[PDB]
Amino acid sequence: GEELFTGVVPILVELDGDVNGHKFSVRGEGEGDATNGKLTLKFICTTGKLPVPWPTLVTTLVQCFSRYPDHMKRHDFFKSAMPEGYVQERTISFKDDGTYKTRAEVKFEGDTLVNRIELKGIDFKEFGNILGHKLEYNFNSHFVYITADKQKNGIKANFKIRHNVEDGSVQLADHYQQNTPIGDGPVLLPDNHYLSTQSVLSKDPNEKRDHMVLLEFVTAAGITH
Numbered sequence: 001g002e003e004l005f006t007g008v009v010p011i012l013v014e015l016d017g018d019v020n021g022h023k024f025s026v027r028g029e030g031e032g033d034a035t036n037g038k039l040t041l042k043f044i045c046t047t048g049k050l051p052v053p054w055p056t057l058v059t060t061l062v063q064c065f066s067r068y069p070d071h072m073k074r075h076d077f078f079k080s081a082m083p084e085g086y087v088q089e090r091t092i093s094f095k096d097d098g099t100y101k102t103r104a105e106v107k108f109e110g111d112t113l114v115n116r117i118e119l120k121g122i123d124f125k126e127f128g129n130i131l132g133h134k135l136e137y138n139f140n141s142h143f144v145y146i147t148a149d150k151q152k153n154g155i156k157a158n159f160k161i162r163h164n165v166e167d168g169s170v171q172l173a174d175h176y177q178q179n180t181p182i183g184d185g186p187v188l189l190p191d192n193h194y195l196s197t198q199s200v201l202s203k204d205p206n207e208k209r210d211h212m213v214l215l216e217f218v219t220a221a222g223i224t225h
Contacts, residue, residue: 019121022051037067098124
């Protein structure tokens with residue numbers, strides 16, 4: 001299960017979204033390096049301009065690439081559900097604004113880890129921070145708290161994402177998350193821990209499509225050796 005992740009692994013991310021009727025698609029490729037907890041990905045909006053700001057899609061656009069330290073390896077649900085993978089479901093509530101609901105299947109197809117997502121955003125204020133494009137092009141650092149969901153043979157997670165707003169203020173996105181194994185084989189259910197996540201966003205200066213270049217670093221912690 002973890003063996004699938006010892007080297008560099010090609011990644012494919014595919015998102016279809018509908019926000020307040022804006023229909024759009026994102027495709028991203030790149031590679032993950034679970035050993036160092038590192039992703040590098042380029043994302044393209046294939047339907048034209050992205051109708052929401054890129055930072056809001058970041059948590060939706062593969063936590064199996066988290067680097068778990070040796071002494072925590074028994075708490076890695078993500079890798080253990082591999083290669084048949086897992087389903088990852090989120091409700092994301094933007095403070096004083098709309099909601100994303102997301103459903104993704106994360107699994108291997110051949111040598112490639114694939115994150116396939118449908119996204120539905122409703123109730124967004126036009127001229128709010130999201131449909132208004134008022135979020136800075138960057139991303140902050142967070143703790144993702146994970147807990148075992150024994151009855152669904154999976155895990156749950158809560159966290160608040162803080163999005164920098166161009167006027168200096170911060171927009172909250174309350175994330176609720178459930179992951180559930182695809183396939184009836186055995187998986188690892190973790191003691192309570194967290195993932196520490198850090199992300200850098202940039203642009204390709206030769207890319208003319210609307211896009212995001214993403215670097216991510218994640219390590220699991222919160223369980224004392």
